[PDB]
C-alpha cells in the first residue's frame, strides 16, 4: 500500500478503468475568510455583494498514462487538481462561483526506495504544470511551471517538497513569483487516524507567501472530517497577491496520507 505514495499508488493496477487515482487531497469544506478580494474581482456584477463565507472544494485525480515508460517503478502520468471558491450562501447573487483554478499536470513519476536516515524518498516526480482560473481578463490569472515533486516518509511523518521553475507567459500576473515563491513544502503527521498537515509556499526574498494547516479524522472508511486554516497569499490564483485568513470545515476523501 505505502500510504501517501502518489506514484506507487498509480503503479497499482485498477480493476475498473473508471476507478481513478487520487493525486492530491480531495475535499469539500464550508469556509469563511478574513477578507474577501473584492478589488481584483470588482469586474463582477456581484463583487460588491460578495460574502466572506463560501464553499471551498478541491478535486485532485491522477491518470497513469503509461506505466514502465522508464523502468519497472516508473510512470508517465497526468493529474488534475481543481480548487474552487463558491458563494453557495450568497443566494442574492444566485450562488456564483467566485474562482476556480484548473491545474492539470503531465509528468514522469517514479516510486523510489532511497534511504535518508529513517526517511524514505518514496516519490520522485517531474513534470509540467498548468494553473489557470479559466477567466477572461481583467480577472485573468495563469502561470506555467516545470516542477519536481519529492516525497519522503519517516514513520508518522511525511514531507514533500515541490520546487518549480516558471515557464511561458505570466503577463496575467507577472509578479506571481513574488507571492508564490519557487517551491511548495508539505508536511503531514499521522497521529493514529488523525492526520495533521501543513502546506505552504514562501518567497525568502520578498517575505511574501501563504500556508495552510489541516486536521482530519475518519468519519468512515472512505470519508473524513476535515478542518482547514489557510493564511497568507496565494490561496487562489486571483488572490495570489492577496493576503487573507480562511478557516473552513467539511468533508474529505483522501488526506496527504
Ligand atoms: Ca491577459
Swiss-Prot record:
Its main location: membrane. Ca(2+) 2 binds at residues 135, 140. One of its GO terms (biological process) is phosphatidylglycerol metabolic process. The chain crosses the membrane at residues 21-33, 53-67, 74-86, 97-116, 119-132, 142-154, 157-166, 185-191, 194-202, 210-218, 224-233, 243-254. Residues 1-20, 68-73, 117-118, 155-156, 192-193, 219-223, 255-257 are periplasmic. GO terms for cellular component: cell outer membrane. GO terms for molecular function: calcium ion binding; lysophospholipase activity; phospholipase A1 activity; phospholipase A2 activity; phospholipase activity; protein homodimerization activity. It is an enzyme of class 3 (hydrolase). It is found in: Cell outer membrane. It is a multi-pass membrane protein. By membrane damage, for example, by phage-induced lysis or temperature shock. The protein is inactive in the monomeric form and active in the dimeric form; calcium is essential for dimer stability. Ca(2+) 1 binds at residue 94. Changing residue 140 to F: Inactive protein. Residues 34-52, 87-96, 133-141, 167-184, 203-209, 234-242 are extracellular. InterPro entries: PLipase_A1, PLipase_A1_sf. Ca(2+) 3 binds at residue 172. Belongs to the phospholipase A1 family. Has broad substrate specificity including hydrolysis of phosphatidylcholine with phospholipase A2 (EC 3.1.1.4) and phospholipase A1 (EC 3.1.1.32) activities. Strong expression leads to outer membrane breakdown and cell death; is dormant in normal growing cells. Required for efficient secretion of bacteriocins. Homodimer; dimerization is reversible, and the dimeric form is the active one. This is Phospholipase A1. It comes from Escherichia coli (strain K12). The lineage of its organism: Bacteria, Pseudomonadati, Pseudomonadota, Gammaproteobacteria, Enterobacterales. The gene is pldA.
Amino acid at each position: 500500500a505505502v500510504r501517501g505514495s502518489i506514484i506507487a499508488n498509480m503503479l497499482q493496477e485498477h480493476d475498473n478503468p473508471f476507478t481513478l487515482y487520487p493525486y492530491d487531497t480531495n475535499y469539500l469544506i464550508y469556509t469563511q475568510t478574513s477578507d474577501l478580494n473584492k478589488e481584483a474581482i470588482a469586474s463582477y456584477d456581484w463583487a460588491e455583494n460578495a460574502r466572506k463565507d463560501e464553499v471551498k472544494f478541491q478535486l485532485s485525480l491522477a491518470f497513469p498514462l503509461w506505466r514502465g515508460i522508464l523502468g519497472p517503478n516508473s510512470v508517465l502520468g497526468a493529474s488534475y487538481t481543481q480548487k474552487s471558491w463558491w458563494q453557495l450562501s450568497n443566494s442574492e447573487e444566485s450562488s456564483p462561483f467566485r474562482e476556480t483554478n484548473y491545474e492539470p499536470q503531465l509528468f514522469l513519476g517514479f516510486a523510489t526506495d532511497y534511504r535518508f536516515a529513517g526517511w524514505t524518498l518514496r516519490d520522485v516526480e517531474m513534470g509540467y504544470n498548468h494553473d489557470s482560473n479559466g477567466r477572461s481578463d481583467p480577472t485573468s490569472r495563469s502561470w506555467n511551471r516545470l516542477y519536481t515533486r519529492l516525497m519522503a516518509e519517516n514513520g508518522n511523518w511525511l514531507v514533500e517538497v515541490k520546487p518549480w521553475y516558471v515557464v511561458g507567459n505570466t503577463d496575467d500576473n507577472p509578479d506571481i513569483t513574488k507571492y508564490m515563491g519557487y517551491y511548495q513544502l508539505k508536511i503531514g503527521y499521522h497521529l493514529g487516524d488523525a492526520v495533521l498537515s501543513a502546506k505552504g509556499q514562501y518567497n525568502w526574498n520578498t517575505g511574501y507567501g501563504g500556508a495552510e494547516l489541516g486536521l482530519s479524522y475518519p468519519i468512515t472508511k472512505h470519508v473524513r472530517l476535515y478542518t482547514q486554516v489557510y493564511s497568507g497569499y496565494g490561496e487562489s490564483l486571483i488572490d495570489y497577491n492577496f493576503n487573507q485568513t480562511r478557516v473552513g470545515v467539511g468533508v474529505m476523501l483522501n488526506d496527504l496520507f
